[PDB]
């Protein structure tokens, strides 16, 4: 069920994109750091524990759901002086107790396969 439209929303984790770009790229919404973080973690916890790593994966590398239209969902693209590799490295740490501290399918707050 961990697919956009099903257990995962279409265009997943809008606020996490911004928090990732704010930190790495320096460009983001005009919101205080804690607010930026909170909104990201909120959207993340609203996703079933089991689908949480998949969601990160989609936000990082994007996804293409089958269908007549099928548009590219998520994915972190390059920003002026902010390559996609920098953003990805930080995005991978979102579930960490350091960041959002949320449990995945493993029951532990970590996604070992996400990065790379």
UniProtKB/Swiss-Prot annotation:
Species whose genome carries this gene: Zea mays
Subcellular location: Secreted
Described purpose of this protein according to its UniProt entry: Potent inhibitor of mammalian trypsin and a specific inhibitor of factor XIIa (activated hageman factor).
GO cellular component annotations of the record: extracellular region
Molecular function as annotated in GO: serine-type endopeptidase inhibitor activity
Family: Belongs to the protease inhibitor I6 (cereal trypsin/alpha-amylase inhibitor) family.
KW Nucleotide-binding (keyword) present: no
Keyword annotations from UniProtKB, A to Z: Disulfide bond, Protease inhibitor, Secreted, Serine protease inhibitor, Signal
Subunit and interaction comment: Monomer.
S-S pairs: 2-51, 16-40, 25-82, 41-100, 53-111
Active site residues according to the UniProt entry: 30
Organismal lineage: Eukaryota, Viridiplantae, Streptophyta, Embryophyta, Tracheophyta
Name listed for the protein in its UniProt record: Trypsin/factor XIIA inhibitor
Miscellaneous notes: The sequence heterogeneity suggests that 2 genes exist for this inhibitor. The genes may be alleles, or multiple loci could exist.
């Amino acid at each position: 069920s961990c697919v956009p439209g099903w257990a995962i929303p279409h265009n997943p984790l809008p606020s996490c994109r911004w928090y990732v770009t704010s930190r790495t790229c320096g460009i983001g919404p005009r919101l205080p750091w804690p607010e930026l973080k909170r909104r990201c973690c909120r959207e993340l916890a609203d996703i079933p524990a089991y689908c949480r790593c998949t969601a990160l994966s989609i936000l990082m590398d994007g996804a293409i759901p089958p269908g007549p239209d099928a548009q590219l969902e998520g994915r972190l693209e390059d920003l002026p002086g902010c390559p996609r590799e920098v953003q990805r490295g930080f995005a991978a740490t979102l579930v960490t107790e350091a960041e959002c501290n949320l449990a995945t399918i493993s029951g532990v707050a970590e996604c070992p396969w996400i990065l790379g």
